[PDB]
Design an enzyme around this catalytic site. Structure first.
Site, mmCIF file in Angstrom:
data_model
loop_
_atom_site.group_PDB
_atom_site.id
_atom_site.type_symbol
_atom_site.label_atom_id
_atom_site.label_comp_id
_atom_site.label_asym_id
_atom_site.label_seq_id
_atom_site.Cartn_x
_atom_site.Cartn_y
_atom_site.Cartn_z
ATOM 1 C CG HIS A 39 -0.427 0.156 2.524
ATOM 2 N ND1 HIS A 39 -0.171 -0.917 3.351
ATOM 3 C CD2 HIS A 39 -0.170 1.264 3.258
ATOM 4 C CE1 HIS A 39 0.262 -0.480 4.519
ATOM 5 N NE2 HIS A 39 0.283 0.840 4.485
ATOM 6 N N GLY A 141 2.823 5.735 9.678
ATOM 7 C CA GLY A 141 4.206 5.723 9.278
ATOM 8 C C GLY A 141 4.981 4.478 9.694
ATOM 9 C CB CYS A 143 3.041 0.234 7.187
ATOM 10 S SG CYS A 143 1.369 0.154 7.921
HETATM 11 C C1 LIG Z 1 0.844 1.867 7.996
HETATM 12 O O1 LIG Z 1 0.750 2.339 6.669
HETATM 13 C C2 LIG Z 1 -0.483 1.975 8.723
HETATM 14 C C3 LIG Z 1 -0.411 1.440 10.151
HETATM 15 C C4 LIG Z 1 -1.664 1.761 10.965
HETATM 16 C C5 LIG Z 1 -2.001 3.241 11.098
HETATM 17 C C6 LIG Z 1 -2.648 3.358 12.466
HETATM 18 N N1 LIG Z 1 -2.027 2.258 13.195
HETATM 19 C C7 LIG Z 1 -1.596 1.284 12.402
HETATM 20 O O2 LIG Z 1 -1.227 0.161 12.770
HETATM 21 N N2 LIG Z 1 -1.522 1.262 7.977
HETATM 22 C C8 LIG Z 1 -2.652 1.840 7.562
HETATM 23 O O3 LIG Z 1 -2.910 3.023 7.760
HETATM 24 C C9 LIG Z 1 -3.647 0.944 6.835
HETATM 25 C C10 LIG Z 1 -3.556 1.114 5.323
HETATM 26 C C11 LIG Z 1 -4.277 0.028 4.526
HETATM 27 C C12 LIG Z 1 -4.500 0.461 3.089
HETATM 28 C C13 LIG Z 1 -3.500 -1.279 4.571
HETATM 29 N N3 LIG Z 1 -5.008 1.199 7.260
HETATM 30 C C14 LIG Z 1 -5.430 0.913 8.485
HETATM 31 O O4 LIG Z 1 -4.795 0.349 9.356
HETATM 32 O O5 LIG Z 1 -6.708 1.332 8.598
HETATM 33 C C15 LIG Z 1 -7.409 0.986 9.832
HETATM 34 C C16 LIG Z 1 -7.366 2.192 10.743
HETATM 35 C C17 LIG Z 1 -8.186 1.952 12.010
HETATM 36 C C18 LIG Z 1 -9.625 1.562 11.696
HETATM 37 C C19 LIG Z 1 -10.441 1.318 12.962
HETATM 38 C C20 LIG Z 1 -11.938 1.167 12.757
HETATM 39 C C21 LIG Z 1 -12.709 1.289 14.049
HETATM 40 C C22 LIG Z 1 -9.644 0.355 10.765
HETATM 41 C C23 LIG Z 1 -8.832 0.610 9.495
#
Ligand SMILES: *[C@@H](O)[C@H](C[C@@H]1CCNC1=O)NC(=O)[C@H](CC(C)C)NC(=O)O[C@H]1CC[C@H](CCC)CC1
Ligand SMILES: *[C@@H](O)[C@H](C[C@@H]1CCNC1=O)NC(=O)[C@H](CC(C)C)NC(=O)O[C@H]1CC[C@H](CCC)CC1
Lengths: 299, 299
Positions: A39, A141, A143
């Site tokens: 991603h 950040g 990932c």
């Molecule tokens: C690294 O790019 C990042 C890591 C996370 C950000 C917040 N904490 C993490 O572990 N990943 C993402 O942002 C990821 C991107 C996807 C396209 C793979 N999206 C993600 O983790 O979305 C989550 C955010 C929290 C939310 C909670 C719902 C109640 C569910 C989707």
């Protein structure tokens, strides 16, 4: 007795920064390949429902900016493997340690080197839960941060970080890009299902408590495998098998406490709670130490 | 939210093995000096009541065997500084990082790189307790392991390990060889005195809990500094000062929870316990995170 991570130096030398557009995250640089979460090719308006094949077709080698410290690496090839990108670079990492990629089993532990912008921030110990999540500490950040074990001189990479679930726990892939568990890399709330407690690890930790002088929870009872498991099932504990009993054999020997006697003590703890007492400084039953972890730390 | 250690690679490159007679422990190799606990010169029949000056007079440079991996270093001078030995060697460590020696304050945290035979085994995070002990994980052979912080590129060494106390906690020196606390390096049971809880750290951790969604312990009460401290004193909590209040200012701002409101919540937790509930996965109040630690991990 402490939650201890592996020394992180061999992995620190492999972390790089990967930028595609304005998205930046961490990559792992081994030999002439950089591995990172696919991603990195997404914009914020892609992450809800990304078509990764279509997104990647618009990207060329020069669209991937890879930085190791002050040095920009030159990308000479790219491909997608499951949920990871492999960027071929023109420079083999001179700090590449001896390494392999492993897909770890639920119940096993590993160290996480949390990184931002390609720079290590801290290291801690995690377990792969039965439901294939981990309870990490990860921010935007993070990932591309990796989990690993060290076996002598050899680093076994087992995890790369990709996402957060609604419960605040975390999900990611092995280094071939295959998620642990049912998860997919898109920005939706996803279900992990019931988390169960890693029974053999709780027993390992009760043995570590005995080794460390803390012995008030021991009793004059014993039990059977079938009868304990009737109580394990009730509390969403994993069933104990004879293989687990034999894995605990060495700890049982060093303490002279029969595994099924420790099981009887666990049953009482499960049924009666800790009555405000503590075990190794904890008022909860700890399940993220394997028997091997406990042996490692008491030697 | 996790107990996280600093990445350990810069320190891993400084650990060596030091042997005098049959006693072996760890040394820290920086520039052309190796630092280690002076009791490396003791035999088992010296450690009850050692006269270190008399023991050291019988030792020459060639009696100190220093090994960095497969390489034996040549000792060309030695001296004792407080409870540490300084061995001058003929080779400056090519892996010497930017570094300084600091004497840390009670309540502050640091990372420990636990080592055996000069080889890193694991890394974890500790606090210097008010009573100048630390709650580590150390075995025979672990002395000379060090505690440190990293400030950008610079390693601040603050601790070297020397001994265990009857309570299972640990005691050691700064890198000038001065013990933290009233302890001496001889094999006797020594008293640390009442351990008090690091109040400002407990509040930092309650703020971290709020940041991480866990907010059930907040209430509709507030208090005063003097009145909370009446309750702090009762529970062997450190008194809270205005400097602590201002140190917590940023966390108070990010959560919009007045410090004295959080204090009121802490009072209730102290007076009522957690009623079987948990905070950041713990059934106890955690005091080994500083405000700076909490800011670092939520950024
Ligand atoms: C690294 O790019 C990042 C890591 C996370 C950000 C917040 N904490 C993490 O572990 N990943 C993402 O942002 C990821 C991107 C996807 C396209 C793979 N999206 C993600 O983790 O979305 C989550 C955010 C929290 C939310 C909670 C719902 C109640 C569910 C989707
Ligand atoms: C490193 O040389 C070693 C580290 C300790 C061994 C066990 N765990 C440790 O933290 N130090 C010592 O062995 C030290 C040597 C002294 C000459 C400085 N002695 C020591 O720690 O003795 C202790 C052992 C435990 C005992 C408990 C009484 C109930 C008190 C003396």
């Amino acid at each position: 007795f402490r939650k201890m991570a592996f020394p992180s130096g061999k992995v620190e030398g492999c972390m790089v920064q990967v930028t595609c557009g304005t998205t930046t995250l961490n990559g792992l640089w081994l030999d002439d390949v950089v591995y990172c979460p696919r991603h990195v090719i997404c914009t914020s308006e892609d992450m809800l429902n990304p078509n990764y094949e279509d997104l990647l077709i618009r990207k060329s080698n020069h669209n991937f900016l890879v930085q190791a410290g002050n040095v920009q690496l030159r990308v000479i090839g790219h491909s997608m493997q499951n949920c990871v990108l492999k960027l071929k670079v023109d420079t083999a990492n001179p700090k590449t340690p001896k390494y392999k990629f492993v897909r770890i089993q639920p119940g096993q532990t590993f160290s996480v080197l949390a990184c931002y912008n390609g720079s290590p921030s801290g290291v801690y110990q995690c377990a792969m839960r039965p439901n294939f999540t981990i309870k990490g500490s990860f921010l935007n950040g993070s990932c591309g941060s990796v989990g690993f074990n060290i076996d002598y001189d050899c680093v076994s990479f087992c995890y790369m970080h990709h996402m957060e679930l609604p419960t605040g726990v975390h999900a990611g892939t092995d280094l071939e890009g295959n998620f642990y568990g049912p998860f997919v890399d898109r920005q939706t709330a996803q279900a992990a299902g019931t988390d169960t407690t890693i029974t053999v690890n709780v027993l390992a930790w009760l043995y570590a408590a005995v080794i460390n002088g803390d012995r008030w929870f021991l009793n004059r009872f014993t039990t059977t495998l079938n009868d304990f498991n009737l109580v394990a099932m009730k509390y969403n504990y994993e069933p104990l098998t004879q293989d687990h009993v034999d894995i605990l054999g060495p700890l049982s020997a060093q303490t002279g406490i029969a595994v099924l006697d420790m099981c009887a003590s666990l049953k009482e703890l499960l049924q009666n709670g800790m009555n405000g007492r503590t075990i190794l400084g904890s008022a909860l039953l700890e399940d993220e130490f394997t028997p091997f972890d406990v042996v490692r730390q008491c030697s």
